[PDB]
Design a protein around this nucleic acid. Structure first.
Lengths: 50, 185, 35, 141, 84, 99, 181
RNA sequence: UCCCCCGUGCCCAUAGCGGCGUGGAACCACCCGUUCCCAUUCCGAACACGGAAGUGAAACGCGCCAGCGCCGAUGGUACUGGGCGGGCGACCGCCUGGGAGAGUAGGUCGGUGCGGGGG
RNA sequence: CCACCAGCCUACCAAACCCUGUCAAACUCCGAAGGGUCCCAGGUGGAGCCUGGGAGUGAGGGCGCGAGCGAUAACGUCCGCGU
RNA sequence: AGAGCGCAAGGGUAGAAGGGGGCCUGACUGCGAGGCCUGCAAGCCGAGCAGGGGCGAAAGCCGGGCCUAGUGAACCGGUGGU
């Protein structure tokens, strides 16, 4: 169920993804959690859309 | 008491019982010799037995030694003996079951009541030199419900005990009737 | 009882209503009571 | 009557009735008692048939030790109805008893009395019976 | 035919029995990958050259010879020793 | 009561089963399987100095040279209620390299 | 080694009274103090929770040692609160601290128990411990009026090294306790 | 080569629960101090750090008792691949190889590699 | 039957407790028979392997014993190895 | 070890998978040995490797959570992007 809406953590550097899920019912805002894209290393990873 | 017991070998105990010479095993400390009694007189003299007596086995080997019973095998179906174990005796204090000669007709008794013979056999240790036949337990002033137990009985100087001491040896209870049609509900 | 904001210690009296001069070491600097 | 009021599995199957008493065919209780002869279920309603004519015939009598407890559901199903549609309901609460199993005894009564009383009492019980004392029934608790 | 009152149920559903048990026994050779036990709880516990992923399941790391281990005061183990 | 088999975490590979008991530090190296041991370095039973943290230091690297004489390389520091208090002997510069 | 009036008291007092009416001929068997713990077991911080805790922290000030908020464990359906995290303060106190504690205690706390007829010689745990309860929190010398709200007692938890009756009550009587008789 | 104690693995309660007895000169546990590493969801409890006095009490190492715990023969039944039959049935018997539980007897308060500290 | 708090109890109701008997598929302290699988060896047999084309065949039914449903009724009817 | 282990049980579990805390953020990238399962199609456990990163002195751990459900082939499209 939503209020926990899902998102695809898009990274900077012009794309590269890892897929997750939020939590609106929790104080969780946007999320720039440290993950590793298809190209490079454990750099950044932010949050976009659904 | 007396009972001719013949040695056993390696035959099938099936034949034994169904021929008369009834299969039974005896042991003691290290031994576990193989013999058999007979159908008729073993069963007869066993009514006079139980682990209250000293049974002699007169083995046709020139030996004749006493034992006490232990672990009897009934045939379940058509219930009647099909094996007996015999623990041999010594003379250093060992353990068996004492019978309780109930002596006394109290007040719950007589004025109704039903006898409650609980541990008709109690676990006790005696020196096999003095093998006391029985011990008389007395009801005397016992009303329906109440009970007799522990150190209320007789203990011959050579007789020492070990059961609870608590455990009820005997008691009395209400005798039922047709006013249970009223209870029926 | 190290930690941080521990409520302190320090000496104190017991100037009772009888004539007691008991020496103590309690959280309050100056106390006095009955007996 | 008497039985459990709420056990585990209400609808419980029948199974199989082979033999051996499972244990409990000695005496250990009353003066004179009754032993089964046919390996099967045995009714509670019949247990109380027994106890009825028994304790009835001998009013002001002794005491009864019934070592039998009838708690196995009957799988009984409606009349004038088709097959399937469900499984039988927990009717007739009976017990698993084979021959030998010293069903039930009494004490505080005289020989001839226990003889006749248990004779009719057991007579009622849905089979054939045997009547036992307390002699060669020694030691096997 | 006057079929008096009937009934219905809910007890018609049954979970699908997925294949369970140990796959190898003392002797066989695993080759890194050859899983050996589809178990629930630690009915058998890993040790030498034996792994255990996410489902409680012991498997292969080396080209090993299977063996068991009785330990009681810890349970039962499954060990593997290849060549050495 | 720090059993846990913290020594199951020391089932891992190779062992250095120590145990300080008030006065002497009973530090030891054990090879496994065979249950055959190796080293029994100590403080006061070693007939060296007499303090906890000092001997430790030195004895730690004593062990260094020891193992580097017997062609080993690494093992594993072991105790129930260890907590690790450096003692930068910490038997790793002491041979093991594991520090 | 902070010296208090009860320290030097219990000091000499315990030893030869025990050496004379008793005597465990082995210098280290005579049992003495141990742990002085206190716990009030409310459950009335159903809500208003930790505002009812500040009432209990000024208590931590009177002894001089911070407390730990211990809690419930199950699912209560009467006085509310399930899971288990209410107002069950368990405060732990030791050697020199229990000394100033039971100093103000045995010297000036027990006299204003207006119901005073003596400590209970029956609330012993027979293992060298002595639990009981009380009614007012202001019976402890350093908490004036302008601070107390409703009602607040506590359940005194004093454990000793002792483990037999007569000597438990004896240690306490050698410490200066106001018991029954 | 051996006895004792302290670190340890291993068989996996015949290993332990209780009771009684015993040493600490060594190792050991306390103990004392919290100046100091550490740290208390609060507590010198603790995990530690600084070691005189003193202790063998709690811990422990060892024994003596079966009282509980556990192990438990085997004489022997229950049953069971295989095969053969009796009755309407439910079930039952025969020959063969196998063959427990129960508890009867009895047993055991255990033993073994490595390492070190002492004679 | 008193309060410094308690003393006290019944041929009264009444849990825990144990002894005596105890039943269970979804209860398991023990657990067979057998069955299943891998190694060695024998086993020469309308065996087994691989590939390819050519097939069909998928309401099965009396019997035995292992369980169910029925009602410990059915030429009932649903699985099981076996026939 | 009958407690607790999100929600059904079963099973397993304290020599943790439970309960508290410090630093993070491996519900990673490229793969994939080999097995379980099974007509297919999916489902499934995953040594070990190369980049890089967290923790821990280190040994070593991290490709989600004790586990057995929390699912939808393919086209037809929608957004960001090569």
């Amino acid at each position: 169920v939503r209020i926990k809406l899902l998102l695809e953590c898009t990274e900077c550097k012009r794309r590269n993804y890892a897929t997750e899920k939020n939590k609106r019912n929790t104080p969780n805002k946007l999320e720039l959690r440290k993950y590793c894209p298809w190209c490079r290393k454990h750099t950044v990873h932010r949050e976009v859309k659904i | 008491y007396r009972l001719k017991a013949y040695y056993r070998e390696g035959e099938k105990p099936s034949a034994l019982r169904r021929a008369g010479k009834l299969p039974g095993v005896m042991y003691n400390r290290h031994l576990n010799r193989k013999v058999y009694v007979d159908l008729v007189e073993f069963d007869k003299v066993f009514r006079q037995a139980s682990i209250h007596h000293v049974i002699v086995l007169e083995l046709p080997d020139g030996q004749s030694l006493p034992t006490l019973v232990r672990q009897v095998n009934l045939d379940k179906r058509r219930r009647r003996p099909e094996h007996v174990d015999f623990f041999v005796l010594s003379d250093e204090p060992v353990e068996m079951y004492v019978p309780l000669r109930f002596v006394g007709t109290p007040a719950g008794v007589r004025a109704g009541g039903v006898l409650q013979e609980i541990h008709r056999d109690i676990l006790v240790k005696v020196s096999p030199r003095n093998i006391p036949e029985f011990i008389e337990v007395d009801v005397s002033g016992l009303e329906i419900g109440d009970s007799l137990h522990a150190s209320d009985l007789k203990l011959p100087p050579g007789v020492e005990l070990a059961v609870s001491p608590e455990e009820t040896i005997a008691a009395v209870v209400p005798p039922e009737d047709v006013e249970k049609l009223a209870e029926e509900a | 009882m190290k930690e941080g904001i521990h409520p302190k210690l320090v000496p104190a009296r017991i100037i009772c209503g009888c004539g007691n001069v008991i020496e103590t070491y309690s959280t309050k600097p100056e106390i006095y009571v009955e007996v | 009557m008497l039985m459990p009021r709420r056990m585990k599995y209400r609808k419980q199957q029948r199974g199989r009735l082979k033999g051996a008493t499972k244990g409990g065919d000695y005496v250990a209780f009353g003066d004179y008692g009754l032993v089964a002869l046919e390996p099967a279920w045995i009714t509670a309603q019949q247990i109380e048939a027994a106890r009825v004519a028994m304790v009835r015939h001998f009013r002001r009598g002794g005491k009864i030790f019934i070592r039998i407890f009838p708690d196995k559901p009957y799988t009984k199903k409606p009349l004038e109805v088709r097959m399937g549609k469900g499984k039988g309901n927990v009717e007739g609460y009976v017990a698993v008893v084979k021959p030998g199993r010293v069903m039930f005894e009494v004490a505080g009564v005289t020989e001839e009395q226990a003889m006749e009383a248990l004779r009719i009492a057991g007579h009622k019980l849905p089979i054939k019976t045997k009547i036992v004392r307390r002699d060669a029934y020694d030691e096997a608790q | 035919a006057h079929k008096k009152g009937l009934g219905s149920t809910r007890n018609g559903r049954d979970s699908q029995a997925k294949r369970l048990g140990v796959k190898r026994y003392e002797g066989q050779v695993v080759r890194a990958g050859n899983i050996l036990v589809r178990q629930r709880g630690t009915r058998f516990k890993p040790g030498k050259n034996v792994g255990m992923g996410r489902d409680f399941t012991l498997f292969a790391l080396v080209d090993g010879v299977v063996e068991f281990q009785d330990r009681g005061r810890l349970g039962r183990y499954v060990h593997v020793r290849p060549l050495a | 009561k720090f059993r846990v088999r913290n020594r199951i975490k020391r089932t891992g590979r190779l062992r250095l089963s120590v145990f300080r008991s008030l006065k002497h530090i009973y530090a030891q190296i054990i090879d496994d399987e065979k249950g055959v041991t190796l080293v029994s370095a100590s403080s006061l039973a070693l007939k060296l100095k007499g303090n906890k943290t000092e001997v430790a230091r030195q004895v730690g690297r004593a062990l260094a040279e020891k193992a580097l004489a017997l062609g080993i390389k690494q093992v594993a520091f072991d105790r129930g209620p260890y907590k690790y208090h450096g003692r930068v002997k910490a038997l790793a510069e002491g041979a093991r390299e594991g520090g | 080694p902070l010296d208090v009036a009860l320290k030097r008291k219990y000091y000499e007092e315990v030893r030869p009274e025990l050496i004379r009416r008793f005597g465990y001929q082995n210098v280290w068997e005579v049992p003495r103090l141990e742990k002085v713990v206190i716990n009030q077991g409310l459950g009335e911080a159903k809500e208003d929770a930790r505002i009812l805790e500040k009432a209990a922290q000024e208590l931590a000030l009177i002894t001089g040692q911070k407390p730990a908020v211990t809690r419930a464990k199950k699912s209560i359906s009467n006085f509310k609160l399930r899971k288990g995290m209410p107002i069950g303060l368990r405060v732990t106190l030791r050697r020199d601290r229990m000394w100033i504690f039971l100093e103000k205690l045995l010297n000036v706390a027990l006299p204003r128990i207006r119901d005073f007829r003596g400590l209970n010689p029956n609330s012993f745990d027979g293992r060298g411990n002595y639990n009981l309860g009380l009614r007012e929190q202001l019976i402890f010398p350093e908490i004036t009026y302008d601070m107390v709200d409703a009602l607040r007692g506590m359940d005194i938890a004093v454990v000793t090294t002792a483990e037999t009756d007569e000597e438990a009550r004896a240690l306490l009587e050698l410490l200066g306790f106001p018991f029954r008789k």
